[PDB]
UniProtKB/Swiss-Prot annotation, chain A:
Protein name: Proteasome subunit alpha type-3
Role played: Component of the 20S core proteasome complex involved in the proteolytic degradation of most intracellular proteins. This complex plays numerous essential roles within the cell by associating with different regulatory particles. Associated with two 19S regulatory particles, forms the 26S proteasome and thus participates in the ATP-dependent degradation of ubiquitinated proteins.
Record-level GO cellular component terms: cytoplasm; cytosol; extracellular exosome; nucleoplasm; nucleus; proteasome complex; proteasome core complex; proteasome core complex, alpha-subunit complex
Keyword Cytoplasm: yes
GO MF entry, a single one: ubiquitin protein ligase binding
Keywords of this entry: Acetylation, Cytoplasm, Host-virus interaction, Nucleus, Phosphoprotein, Proteasome
Induction notes from the record: Down-regulated by antioxidants BO-653 and probucol. Up-regulated by bacterial lipopolysaccharides (LPS) and TNF.
Record gene name: PSMA3
Record-linked PANTHER family: PROTEASOME SUBUNIT ALPHA/BETA (PTHR11599)
Modified residues (N6-acetyllysine): 51, 200, 224
Highest rank taxon of the organism: Eukaryota
Curated annotation (Swiss-Prot), chain B:
UniProtKB keywords: Cytoplasm, Host-virus interaction, Hydrolase, Nucleus, Protease, Proteasome, Threonine protease, Zymogen
Name of the featured protein: Proteasome subunit beta type-7
Function: Component of the 20S core proteasome complex involved in the proteolytic degradation of most intracellular proteins. This complex plays numerous essential roles within the cell by associating with different regulatory particles. Associated with two 19S regulatory particles, forms the 26S proteasome and thus participates in the ATP-dependent degradation of ubiquitinated proteins.
Active site: 1 (nucleophile)
Residues of the full protein shown: 44 to 263 of 277
Catalyzed reactions per annotation: Cleavage of peptide bonds with very broad specificity
GO cellular component labels: cilium; cytoplasm; cytosol; extracellular region; ficolin-1-rich granule lumen; nuclear body; nucleoplasm; nucleus
Entry annotated with the keyword Repeat: no
Gene, per the UniProt record: PSMB7
Tissue expression remark: Expressed at a low level in colonic mucosa. Up-regulated in colorectal cancer tissues.
Organism, as annotated: Homo sapiens
GO biological process: proteasome-mediated ubiquitin-dependent protein catabolic process
UniProtKB/Swiss-Prot annotation, chain E:
UniProt keywords, alphabetically: Acetylation, Cytoplasm, Glycoprotein, Nucleus, Phosphoprotein, Proteasome
PANTHER family reported for this sequence: PROTEASOME SUBUNIT ALPHA/BETA
Phosphotyrosine carried by residues: 151
InterPro entries to which the protein is assigned, alphabetical: Ntn_hydrolases_N, Proteasome_alpha, Proteasome_alpha-type, Proteasome_asu_N, Proteasome_sua/b, Proteasome_subunit_alpha6
Family of the protein in this entry: Belongs to the peptidase T1A family.
GO biological process: positive regulation of canonical NF-kappaB signal transduction; proteasome-mediated ubiquitin-dependent protein catabolic process; proteolysis involved in protein catabolic process; regulation of inflammatory response
Quaternary structure and interacting proteins, as annotated: The 26S proteasome consists of a 20S proteasome core and two 19S regulatory subunits. The 20S proteasome core is a barrel-shaped complex made of 28 subunits that are arranged in four stacked rings. The two outer rings are each formed by seven alpha subunits, and the two inner rings are formed by seven beta subunits. The proteolytic activity is exerted by three beta-subunits PSMB5, PSMB6 and PSMB7. Interacts with ALKBH4.
Name recorded for this polypeptide: Proteasome subunit alpha type-6
Curated annotation (Swiss-Prot), chain F:
Main location: cytoplasm
Impact when changing residue 103 to V: In a colorectal cancer sample; somatic mutation
Subcellular location: Cytoplasm; Nucleus
Function noted in UniProt: Component of the 20S core proteasome complex involved in the proteolytic degradation of most intracellular proteins. This complex plays numerous essential roles within the cell by associating with different regulatory particles. Associated with two 19S regulatory particles, forms the 26S proteasome and thus participates in the ATP-dependent degradation of ubiquitinated proteins.
Cellular component terms (Gene Ontology): cytoplasm; cytosol; extracellular exosome; extracellular region; ficolin-1-rich granule lumen; nucleoplasm; nucleus; P-body
Protein name: Proteasome subunit alpha type-2
Acyltransferase recorded as keyword: no
Gene3D superfamilies: Glutamine Phosphoribosylpyrophosphate, subunit 1, domain 1 (3.60.20.10)
PANTHER family, per database record: PROTEASOME SUBUNIT ALPHA/BETA (PTHR11599)
A GO BP entry: proteasome-mediated ubiquitin-dependent protein catabolic process
Gene of this entry: PSMA2
Superkingdom of the source species: Eukaryota
Species in which this protein is naturally found: Homo sapiens (Human)
Amino acid sequence: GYDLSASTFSPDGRVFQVEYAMKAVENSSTAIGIRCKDGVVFGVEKLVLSKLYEEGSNKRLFNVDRHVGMAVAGLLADARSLADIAREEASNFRSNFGYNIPLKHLADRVAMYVHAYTLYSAVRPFGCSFMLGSYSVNDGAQLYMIDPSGVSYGYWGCAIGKARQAAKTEIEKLQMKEMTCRDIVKEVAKIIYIVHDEVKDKAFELELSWVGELTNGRHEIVPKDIREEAEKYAKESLKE
Amino acid sequence: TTIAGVVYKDGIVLGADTRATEGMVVADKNCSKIHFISPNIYCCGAGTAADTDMTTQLISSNLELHSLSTGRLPRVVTANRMLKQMLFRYQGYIGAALVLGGVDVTGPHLYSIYPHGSTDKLPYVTMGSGSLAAMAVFEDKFRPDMEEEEAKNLVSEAIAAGIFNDLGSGSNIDLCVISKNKLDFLRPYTVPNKKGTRLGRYRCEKGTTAVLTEKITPLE
Amino acid sequence: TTIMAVQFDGGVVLGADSRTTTGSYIANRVTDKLTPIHDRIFCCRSGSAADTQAVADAVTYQLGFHSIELNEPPLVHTAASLFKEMCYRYREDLMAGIIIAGWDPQEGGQVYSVPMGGMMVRQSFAIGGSGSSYIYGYVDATYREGMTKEECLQFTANALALAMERDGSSGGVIRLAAIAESGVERQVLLGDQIPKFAVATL
Amino acid sequence: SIMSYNGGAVMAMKGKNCVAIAADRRFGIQAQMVTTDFQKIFPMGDRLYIGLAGLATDVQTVAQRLKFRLNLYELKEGRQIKPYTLMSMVANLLYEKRFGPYYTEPVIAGLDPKTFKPFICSLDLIGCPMVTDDFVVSGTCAEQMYGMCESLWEPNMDPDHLFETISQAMLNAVDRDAVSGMGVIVHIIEKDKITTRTLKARMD
Amino acid sequence: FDRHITIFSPEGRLYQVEYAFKAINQGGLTSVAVRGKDCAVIVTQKKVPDKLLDSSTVTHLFKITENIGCVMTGMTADSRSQVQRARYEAANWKYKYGYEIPVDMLCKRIADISQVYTQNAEMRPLGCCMILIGIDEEQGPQVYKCDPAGYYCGFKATAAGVKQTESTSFLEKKVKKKFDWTFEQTVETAITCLSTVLSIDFKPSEIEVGVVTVENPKFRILTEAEIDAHLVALAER
Amino acid sequence: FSLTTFSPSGKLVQIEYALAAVAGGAPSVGIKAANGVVLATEKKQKSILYDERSVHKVEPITKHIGLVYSGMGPDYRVLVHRARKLAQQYYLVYQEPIPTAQLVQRVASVMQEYTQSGGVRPFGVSLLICGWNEGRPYLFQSDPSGAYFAWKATAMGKNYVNGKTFLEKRYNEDLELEDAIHTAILTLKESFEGQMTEDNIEVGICNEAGFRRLTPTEVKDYLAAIA
């Protein structure tokens, strides 16, 4: 048929494997990212399938450099691989040019590595979308998302996974261009708690990360005293 | 060897001698040291003759391959960048020292290229063994924005200075004049040296040479 | 060869002689040892002409590709780092002394020297070549932080004139260049414009 | 030196509508003669010959590798080769070893097989041709043969005189070179006949 | 069958290469390019569906060199690859030959690259069209287009996208009268074509315009404050 | 489907189908007069927007060799480059301009390289190669199979049979380069679905002076049934 290879077109110019690889992202848990006035904040709806797994397993927030973070949704092995590629890109950039890679450039370099898998018969496309986020004094805050096809666009707010629609419908309410990171944390946790469905799947963990002035261009996991102070606000705003 | 070039008001004039040595002995008398690169670009060559021949031939073929895809007239910067990029890759083992000159849409250009890949674009350049005698004339008699015949006289004087004061140069002066609307390759231009007329005769008549064996082999 | 670079607040100043020798014969007396890598980044060239010309061409290629695909003007540190990688990866095959001077919006006027072995270090004034030995004292006794463009041009011309007067492999013409946000000015000093100093008679 | 390890001498000389070529017949190591019927002139077609002086290994190797290319050429082509083109073939064959050079300095002599105008050429060991119109030499006695051909050569020469000229040059040259001689052989080639002679020479 | 792999059919046709012309229309956008006596213009529409996207990143105009500009139409990821290859080729041209690549030559280099994908079964063709513009020394302004199959040609005007036939009808109807071509007439013609075939009453936010002229050969992408100046003049007459 | 496969009849089917792509391209004429060779073809555009002074169906390989084709232009631009390289290789070795037959051999070798591997399709072009070597004109016809034919006159592309019978009934020797151009244009006028203008065709001739693509002025001159 016309839907068995990525080297194949259909009579209307469609490549169905690349779309089927997006269908795999649609069936994964939800991650969001919001660009603030002075940083970026990532949030992930981390599902715990069994109580035998430790708290900290299947981390879906990755540090790709000391100023760049990465959140993924889809197949997780594919995401770990793409993280390993995003790391050697930034490594070789510093090795050859002597400074931290920008994110518009890293996004392009990873997008092309992802697009190369949409052309051949010996490989499948990647089964993961993902967001990158950085902050610099010169380049400012930045948030890009990359799809399996190899597309890359900038954002003020974005979501990937099951509850993409439901989450962007809440993110557009935010006036993110006015706010700081500690105030957008509350909103990120509130959205993740709004879109999570306890009947469709079991209990979950909230996973957050930051980059901005308050970390000095260092991508960090959020401390516990703030993550709990936001999870509480999420519970108290569910009275609606 | 002795080669030279100038840039006058309208175009380029090149010059060269014709002697070629293998040691302190003269092998050739009417050599041709000015080589075709394009209908608007010619090159003079010193150093190891085979290296210059093959290098000029290769760049000529590559430019006849480039101009035929583009459909345009070639440029001198392209030839220079080919030559220097190759000679730098061979790290000097190709003993091709050159004087390249032509005329394109941007105007007349003249270059000197050394076998390690260094280049100099100048209004007058000399090269070979009689370089110093040629430049002794250029420094004393050169002027900007000269006419065709003044430039030709200057180059002939330079090559003659290299001839009559260097041992590796002699036996003729060739030139090439290049302009936007003309090209004149002058082989020979002056003949300042002529062998002496011989007085006696040594023509050997049939029989003075002894033979042991003979064979004939007809053909058609 | 005698090359020199200085930074002031707005930007940088560069300078160079015009001589290219082959032993003791002067093959080119009007050489241009200043080289535009980009619109506001220059190279002052010392050492083997072949090696350094090739390195300059290659770095120009690299930085053009980089700057177009970023769509912002490149840094001086970037060009200096490319020079460093090429001069260090091929230090056993190159004889190349480089000074990189230019202007960048992030950090402004900058000067980077890249000697033969391929180390890199930022400087306020950098001197290189074969005549720098004869002016290492003058430039230390005369430099002062807070100089404007014209005072730096004067300094760079006075130093190169001395280095050319004493060094046999340096002479001819002082080619200057000043770089800043506005653009790139270029001068050529020759004849009486080159500074003259007292030569003792007793 | 290198090429003086085996010795040799080759000459070519034109006439009016004819051409000649000559060589010595000695094979020997440094200072010992082994054989007196050594081939150094090789036919490359009718009305076209080539001669080789230098290191005998390279003589045979170049001749065989050139006959290889020539046979393939004139098989693919449907024509015998012109001398101008054999010159370039040899130049390419030798410049392919620009850093592993064959130690030969060939000499070519022939007639174009349509208009039959003579041709003579010389090459170095890395393939720079030299198309003179009087005479060419290569070997260990090059100066001695230059001195004879400069004085004896005349512009227009019928074969009966060309033979005498190219013989009296070779004999009196190799009679002053220690590692060249023990016989001299001459080929005269015209439109209608190729004549071949061995000469009365000293064997010391 | 004769439609899955790049083989020949009994009627001598390549259907996988024809199906790559259909991918150009999946993005759902239309590009237009017009040539003048001293100018050359490219035009396309800028459709953001979300307010969460940064409009600065959503573009289909690209700078290949300082003097050459492009507009890409088709699948968005293929276009970035073709654009990066165009940039690499333009840079290596100048490294090798010492002068800037023309449009006539860059176009056919991209076409030569694209034809190998039709003759070798390694890689898929790219579902993207490409229109370039640039000012030549003697020839003047140039407008060149290349295809997924490796076809290329110069144009006075052309389009790429869904509304391409109904754009080339407008354009061939306007070109025959041969008015005094100018910068303003050129941009007005392009915008009127894109307005007629789409019937949308453009804003300055819904299009992006790149231009190149003999006065200033540097490609420059226009601002919303400069597209409005040309848009207002249309409503007048 | 596959190219490294014979049929029981003993036929190569993908080659036969590559020739079907030649049989559907624009017509191309070839005539070998006594003192020259003519090459003419249909260069017609789908709109007034296409600039016809930018691409050429008649291209030179050397000073004395030239080409036309019928079929696919992308495939043509590869063989043009290959022929131009092979001519320069020949010159680099022998320092003589390549004969017109050796180029045809070495180019049919390239066309044959693309007939023996899997994962490659043959070329969808046939060529007509004109030359002037050794005081004689030449005209050949290379095919995707790797086979060439020397012709005195022929036609390729759409209506290549009636266009050839026209030559069989309207061509002889004792011609010259100007009586043959009229015959070539008359042989193209059979299939011209419209008014023949100077810009709808493209002509190239070879002779003692070498190959040259004529200009639109020279085309408009003889388009009046003149000479």
